[PDB]
Every structure is written in C-alpha cells, then in structure tokens.
C-alpha cells in the first residue's frame, strides 16, 4: 500500500498505456514473442474428412516494455494478475488448422511478470484440417503438419520462436501416436513483398489400427471360405443333394456381398487406401468365380448331373437293354475322378489361401526390417 493504489493509478494501464498503440519501444524491429504448444487432449479423429478436434495449452510469451515495475509493483510482487482488457491480445491463428475458431483461448486471465514480460497460456478446443489424403491409411499413417502464430503482424511487427504429444494423449484413440517434433520459423510469401511473422510448425507423425476390426473381420473370411471349401467336400460325401448344394451357393453368396457392404460404409467414414481393399476384393472374387465354376462342374453331367420262352426273352431283352441306360447314368458318375476333384480344389485352396497370408507375410517381414 506503499503508494500502491496510487501507483497502479500512476501507470493507468488503459490510460497511460496506449491500447491503440503497440508498445514496440517505438520504431525498431518488434516486441519479441514466443509461443509454446502443449496438447491437453485429442477428442475426435476423422479420417474421411481430414479433420481433428483437439485441446491445446496456448503457452504465450512477449515483453510489455511499459510493464517494467518499480517498488510497490515489481518488488511488492515480482508476479501479479491482469485481465484481457488491461491487455493487448494478439490473434494467434492456427494458420492452416484454424478452420475451426479457437475457443476459451481468447482473452482469459493472463500472468504479469514483474517487469513487463507477460505470460498468457490457457486452453484451446480446436478443429483442424490435417494432411490426411487417401494415403494417411497405408501403415505409415504419415505426418500431420500444423503451424501456429500471430497472423496479422510482419517480421517488423512480429517475431515468434518456440514438448510432446503423449502429455495428454486420448487413450480412447483407435490410433497410436509415434512421434511429435517441434521447430519454429519465419516466412516470406508469393503475394507479400516483405518477410514477416514467425510461427510454431509442429509435425505429428502417427499410426492407427484397431485391434478389434481384425477380430470380426478375419473371422468371416475363414468362415466364408470354409463354405466354398465345404461346398466341394460335400459333392463327394454325397453330391446328389443337388438342390441343397445349390442352396448353399445362394446362401454363401448373399452373405459375402453384404459383408463387403459394411466395408465401404465405415469406408466413407474415412477414405480407404489401395493396399488393403485389393487383397479383399480381388480374392473374394477369386471365390465367387469358383462358386460359378462350382456350379457347372458340380451339375454338368447329362445323367450323373415254345412261346413261353419268346415272352420271357422279351423281358431279359428289356432287362439288359435298359441296363445300358441305367448305366448311361453311372457313366456320368465319374468315381475314379473323385480324389482328383477334391485334390484339384485342395491345390487351389492352398494356392490362394496361401497367396493372401503369403502377401501378409511378405509385407510382415519388411517392416520388421
């Protein structure tokens, strides 16, 4: 009380302080600003639309050359508080990731160092348009780029110089955060004939992959498969249930197509890479073809698909005769062909089924590289 009341009447923030004038110590280079970025939370990830809603601690530093203090201000306490109006507030802009206005990181309570230096560093709920592309889905899952800084001012009114990541990871990400570099810069552009405003460039290289699609997704391919699989086993153990062998193909067939239907649905959610989508469809087809081949080659076959003596001789004549007919049917049988069929089904199960987990493994050896 040290002449306190009285001195913060001396200085007058708003009245002695030019609020409409930038205390730059008059005409020189700038007042020297530094930004610090610390994510407090990531609440939602969108793949389809390249958009992320995340929370950041907007740690900000810059010199107020009119905020040098004397005894009952500096010393009384080397550290005090002061509201947003008693307060030049910039517009740090999330330059290319602020297609979603900054919230509750606008004009809240700031920290008043004891000789100008000021410190304002609260919470930012924001939305961003990160470098997704249809390619942030290959396993690398890329590097998310973001730049932060005071938008308005030039390299002669503004200079911003420059933490992890998993400080406050959203554990309820389906993805995984590998890394997180941080390096500032300053930059001159196309349309501006000056250099200027400096910025916080923070690249986020991540990776994602639930442990829960694997589960229900591979489940139905071995399931399915075994239907195609079993389709051909059963035409041996009895291929005369013709209608019912058939039914199965209607059945396995409708089941296969909506399967893949739920596929593009989560799809649109999120733009799909070309890596995964081919092994699926290229192979399902694979089957498909061989269910249609199953068809024909399973039902192809046209069939397997003294006057008392004169009289009973007619019957032994209708006898033998229709025994060549009857036989016309077993013709169709083809049972020395048995083992082959199921054989020549096994060959190709082993070629495809392997071809896939073969492509598995040839891309599951190089990343372990």
């Amino acid at each position: 009380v040290n002449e306190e009341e009285r001195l913060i009447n001396d200085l007058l923030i708003v009245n002695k302080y030019n609020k409409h004038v930038r205390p730059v110590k008059h005409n020189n280079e700038v007042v020297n600003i530094a930004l610090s970025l610390t994510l407090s939370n990531l609440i939602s990830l969108k793949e389809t639309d390249e958009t992320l809603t995340t929370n950041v601690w907007m740690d900000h530093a810059w010199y107020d050359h009119r905020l040098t203090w004397n005894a009952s201000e500096y010393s009384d306490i080397s550290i005090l508080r002061l509201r947003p109006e008693l307060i030049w507030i910039p517009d740090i802009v999330l330059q290319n990731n602020n297609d979603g206005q900054y919230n509750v990181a606008y004009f809240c309570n700031v920290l008043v160092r004891p000789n100008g230096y000021v410190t304002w560093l609260p919470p930012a709920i924001f939305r961003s348009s990160c470098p997704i592309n249809v390619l942030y889905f290959p396993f690398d899952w890329q590097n998310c780029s973001l730049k932060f800084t005071a938008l308005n001012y030039n390299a002669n009114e503004i200079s911003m110089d420059l933490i992890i990541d998993p400080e406050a990871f959203t554990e309820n990400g389906e993805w995984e955060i590998i890394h997180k570099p941080a390096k500032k810069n300053i930059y001159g552009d196309k349309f501006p004939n000056g250099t200027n405003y400096q910025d916080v460039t923070f690249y986020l290289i991540i990776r994602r992959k639930p442990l829960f699609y694997v589960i229900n997704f591979i489940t139905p391919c071995v399931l399915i498969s075994f239907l195609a699989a079993l389709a051909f086993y059963l035409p041996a153990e009895s291929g005369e249930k013709m209608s019912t062998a058939i039914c199965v193909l209607l059945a396995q067939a409708v089941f296969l197509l909506l399967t893949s239907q739920r596929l593009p649905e989560t799809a649109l959610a999120v733009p799909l890479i070309g890596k995964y989508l081919m092994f699926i469809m290229s192979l399902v087809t694979g089957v498909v073809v061989n269910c249609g081949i199953v068809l024909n080659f399973h039902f192809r076959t046209p069939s397997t698909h003294s006057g008392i003596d004169s009289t009973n001789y007619i019957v032994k004549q209708i006898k033998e005769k229709n025994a060549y007919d009857e036989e016309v049917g077993n013709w169709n049988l083809v049972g020395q062909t048995i083992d082959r069929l199921s054989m020549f089904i096994i060959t190709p199960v082993m070629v495809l089924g392997t071809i896939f987990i073969f492509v598995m493994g040839n891309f599951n050896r190089p990343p372990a590289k």
């Binding site: 639309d49 602020n98 013709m242 209607l250 009289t311």
Partner: protein
C-alpha cells in the same frame, strides 16, 4: 514525437466512426475485393450446400489516414483494428447459407498515404446450383453471388482480382472430385436502383474413381448368376425346384440393391442416369427371369392260355410306358436350347447396350468443360 500527439489528435478530431469514406454523392470509394481460397471442406452434393474457406482481402484508400513524420516516415506501415469504417457485410444472394467466421472486424494493414489491406481467412456457409446436375460427366454450372446486405452500390464501387483467379488455384487434392474452372463476372441488377451482387461460375468436374469399379461387378457378376440360371435349365432340368431358389435369391438381391442406392443418393443424389438404365437392366433381369419362368411353366402334363397271362404282362408294361413316353414328347428340351439361345440374344444384346451407353458416356459427354 515529431508532431505525433498532433497527427494522432487531428485524425481523431476529423474522423467520423459512423460515416462513409466519401465526400457526398459521386463515385464513393473504389474498394478492391479478392479472395485467396484456403481449401474447401464439404460439398453437400445432395442439397447444394458449400462450406469453404478463403481470405477476404479488402483494400481501398483512406485519404483521411495519410500520416506525417513519425507514423508515416516513422513507420510507413502500421497495424490497426477495424471497427472504424464501412466493412463488407456481404451475403451471397444464392448462398450466404449462414454467418461469417474470421471474415470481419479483424485488424488490418494500413499504408502510409492510406492504402488499406485487410487479410482474413474465413469459413463460410454457402450453397450454390450445383443442382441435381453435378453428376453427368458433362457436369455443370453455377452462380456464386457475393455482396453486402443493405448497401446498394451508390456510395462505392466493387472490383475483383483475376478472371482466369481460377478455381483450381486451391482445388482440394483430397477430392475424389475435380476442377474445370471458376470465372468471375461483376453485375448490377437493373431491376433495382441498387448495384448489387457478383456472379462466380462453377464449371465443376466430379470423377472419384474408386467404387463404380465394384459397381461394374454387380452388373457383370449379376449376369453371371443370370447366364447361369438360364444355363442351369437345359443343364439339369430337375433344376425344377432349385430354379426358383435361384431367383428368390436373384430377385431379393437386386431389390436390396434398390435398398442401398436410395440411401447413398441420400447425401448425394442427381441425375438418375446411371440408375435410370441399370434400373432398366434391373427390370430386365426381373422380367426376363420371370418369363423364362413362364418358359418353364410350359409343359401341360409335366408342368396257350399260358400266353394269355404273358399278354396281360406284355400289355401292362408297354401300355403305360409310351403314355409316360408321351410326357417325354411333352417336355423334350427343344426350347431350352432355342430359348437359352434366345437367352443368348436377349442377354448378350442387352448387355452390349448399357456397355455402349457406358462406352458413350465416358467418351461423348466429356469434352464440353469449356
């Protein structure tokens, strides 16, 4: 200090907050408008709604803010909030589907003999005439009209940047879509004394090539089952039953296809064109499945005294065999062959048609994007 308090003080002595940057009724003050686009986030193709983001660059000259020694010669460039002046407001006649975000009331760059620069990026909710005419490979057409929303050009004048600026200036790389062009034509609506709006054209091009591909499967795959079920009949005729299971199934299938489609045009719908004839191709393997069914229908049956016994015998077996031999006569498979090759005509003709339509669609209505 070089008469700082002095300039500073004159300016705030002769500036008028509430006033127009003009001296009575000419002419007015010739503002420059020109937008550097950032990117676009969402094309609500269905409804014709456009959410994008750009910079609002405005710039004109304030003869009221010519400085002198210390803020002129001092520092020829100084940043100063707005608030002070006539700002654009602007609505999009069409468009203007909703507010401005970071557009207005943001600081500005003020030059010495009063050139003003204002550099804001913004998101804006717009909706243009993309229509239900944004899917024919020929694509279309739109009007994007920007302009203020009580101000009738009479105290100022609007003028743009380029006219070639393109619309593939900031075309979204992410787009499964594409960029023909965007011109820019200034207009003044004579139905009004007010000088209004400016019309910006969308010659847009939409070719996301990803799932039509497996859409091609259903057209070819479906016919599989088709060729199939018309290749089953004179293959094993005792397809009798199993036949109808084929089609319960074949039908329900192209139905559910009609389930999904209306649901996916949901966000998304246009020109039946694709739909229109695969619908036809639909009604095709409907009615052809059903006729053939009729084809099956068909068959109006099917669908001593010692020698006196012998005789008896002789008659019993032969007698009824030619009667059952009759039915053979009544369902011989002459049709199956001829109509399965009527099936040949019907289906390799209808197939090579929408294959043509399709052939014609990709090659013919492409070019006129100009």
């Amino acid at each position: 200090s070089v008469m700082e308090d002095t300039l500073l003080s004159v300016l705030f002595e002769n500036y008028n907050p509430k006033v127009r940057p003009s001296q009575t009724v000419g002419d007015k003050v010739t503002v420059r408008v020109g937008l550097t686009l950032t990117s676009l986030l969402i094309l609500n193709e269905k409804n014709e709604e456009m959410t994008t983001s750009v910079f609002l660059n405005l710039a004109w000259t304030d003869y009221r803010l010519q400085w002198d020694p210390a803020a002129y010669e001092g520092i020829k460039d100084l940043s100063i909030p707005s608030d002070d002046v006539w700002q654009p407001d602007i609505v999009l006649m069409n468009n203007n589907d909703g507010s401005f975000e970071i557009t207005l009331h943001v600081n500005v760059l003020v030059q010495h003999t009063g050139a003003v620069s204002w550099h804001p990026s913004a998101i804006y909710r717009s909706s243009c005439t993309i229509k239900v005419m944004y899917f024919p490979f020929d694509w279309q057409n739109c009007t994007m009209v920007f302009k203020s929303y009580t101000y009738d050009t009479s105290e100022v004048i609007l003028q743009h940047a380029l006219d070639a600026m393109i619309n593939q200036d900031a075309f979204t790389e992410n787009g499964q879509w594409s960029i023909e062009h965007k011109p820019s034509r200034k207009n003044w609506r004579s139905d009004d004394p007010s000088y209004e709006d400016v019309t910006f054209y969308l010659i847009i091009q939409r070719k996301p090539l990803f799932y039509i591909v497996y859409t091609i499967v259903p057209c070819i795959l479906i016919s599989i089952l088709a060729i199939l079920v018309f290749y089953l009949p004179p293959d094993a005729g005792e397809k009798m039953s199993l036949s109808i299971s084929a089609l319960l199934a074949l039908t329900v299938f192209l139905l559910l296809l009609a389930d999904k489609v209306p649901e996916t045009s949901l966000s998304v719908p246009i020109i039946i064109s694709y739909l229109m004839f695969i619908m036809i191709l639909v009604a095709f393997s409907v009615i052809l499945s059903v006729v053939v069914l009729n084809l099956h229908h068909r068959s109006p049956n099917t669908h001593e005294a010692v020698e006196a016994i012998k005789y008896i015998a002789e008659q019993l077996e032969s007698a009824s065999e030619f009667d059952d031999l009759k039915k053979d006569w009544q369902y011989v498979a002459m049709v199956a062959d001829r109509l399965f090759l009527y099936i040949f005509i019907t289906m390799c003709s209808i197939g090579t048609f929408s294959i043509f339509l399709d052939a014609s669609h990709n090659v013919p209505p492409d070019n006129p994007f100009a």
